Design a protein around this ligand. Structure first.
Ligand SMILES: CC(=O)N1CCN(CCCc2ccccc2)CC1
Length: 315
């Protein structure tokens, strides 16, 4: 509308184009997912694009096979001013997309399963471009879903409090309307969180557990940085000795870049004098490695290790 109306509503190109995409999904899911599929393809630097006859009538693996061939250095490795903000933007895009899809489209059983199936397939690819792009996307995707779970978690607690104050209000009395609605709200929200947890598991078992050991250091670096983000954000699901073994196993990684990340992640855990109890077995297991890394070889790795150890000392 008015210039004042658009300035007082900082909808950016991204949010604008996510809002357009959401509207295009409501008309025709197929073409919208087609456009979203082609987006991930184009972000890898792949020169081909999928048509609706392929999307409808080929099995993912086949689509990936055909896009593999059409591959002339990709947008994420590009240097120069016209790609400085690409990574940053690509990551924000995934966050905006899912933030916006989080209350309806995400729980449709078509949109997330389509994306995660693509990202999983692109993460198994011989092409570096594909492995790098999909994995980074999947790591930002997991974090987006974690933020969805945290939002349910709040709503689950308001619906929990509201049911308690209505179960108690009644007692001895026939279960009225507010009490059947709330007892329904509560199941719906938990069935939402199942579905989130599910997608998280598909992303973790399918993409993470394979990529965190990847040939390329940047891909190992992306996986570690993010498991560290999940473990801080959502302690109860991700902060456990099974998931932590991935971070420990990686402390022994060959690359400064990567060792640096494991320590940065563990740092942010140990600062919280609270999940400190839940790091007790992990610390006993890798004190020898954490501590050994204070004289690492790479100065800036060693610095971090020393900082980590001082943090472990203080608790
Ligand atoms: C039932 C069926 O045959 N379909 C087509 C293939 N599926 C592909 C959609 C996601 C995807 C992943 C990897 C490459 C391309 C596309 C969607 C449904």
């Amino acid at each position: 509308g008015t210039l004042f109306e658009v300035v007082k509503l900082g909808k950016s190109a991204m949010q604008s184009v996510v809002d357009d995409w959401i509207e295009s999904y409501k008309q025709d899911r197929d073409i919208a997912l087609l456009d979203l599929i082609n987006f991930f393809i184009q972000c890898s630097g792949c020169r081909g694009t999928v048509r609706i006859e392929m999307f409808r009538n080929m099995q993912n693996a086949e689509i990936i096979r055909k896009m593999t061939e059409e591959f002339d250095d990709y947008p994420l490795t590009m240097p120069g001013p016209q790609w400085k903000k690409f990574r940053s933007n690509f990551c924000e895009f995934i966050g905006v997309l899912i933030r916006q899809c989080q209350y309806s489209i995400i729980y449709d059983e078509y949109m997330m399963d389509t994306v995660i199936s693509l990202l999983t397939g692109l993460s198994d690819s011989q092409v570096r471009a594909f492995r790098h792009t999909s994995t980074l996307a999947a790591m930002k995707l997991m974090t987006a879903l974690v933020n969805v779970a945290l939002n349910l978690s709040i709503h689950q607690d308001n619906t929990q409090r509201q049911y308690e104050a209505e179960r108690n209000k009644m007692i001895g009395k026939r279960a009225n309307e507010r009490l059947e609605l709330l007892l329904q709200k509560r199941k719906e929200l938990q069935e939402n969180q199942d579905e989130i947890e599910n997608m998280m598991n598909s992303i973790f078992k399918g993409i993470f557990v394979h990529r965190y050991r990847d040939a390329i250091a940047e891909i190992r670096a992306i996986c570690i940085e993010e498991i560290g983000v999940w473990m801080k954000m959502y302690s109860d699901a991700f902060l456990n000795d099974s998931y932590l073994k991935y971070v420990g196993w990686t402390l022994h990684d060959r690359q400064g870049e990567v060792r640096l990340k494991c320590l940065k992640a563990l740092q942010s855990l140990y600062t919280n004098r609270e999940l400190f109890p839940k790091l007790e077995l992990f610390t006993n297991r890798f004190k020898d490695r954490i501590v050994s890394m204070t004289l690492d070889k790479e100065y800036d790795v060693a610095v971090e290790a020393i900082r980590l150890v001082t943090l472990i000392l203080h608790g």
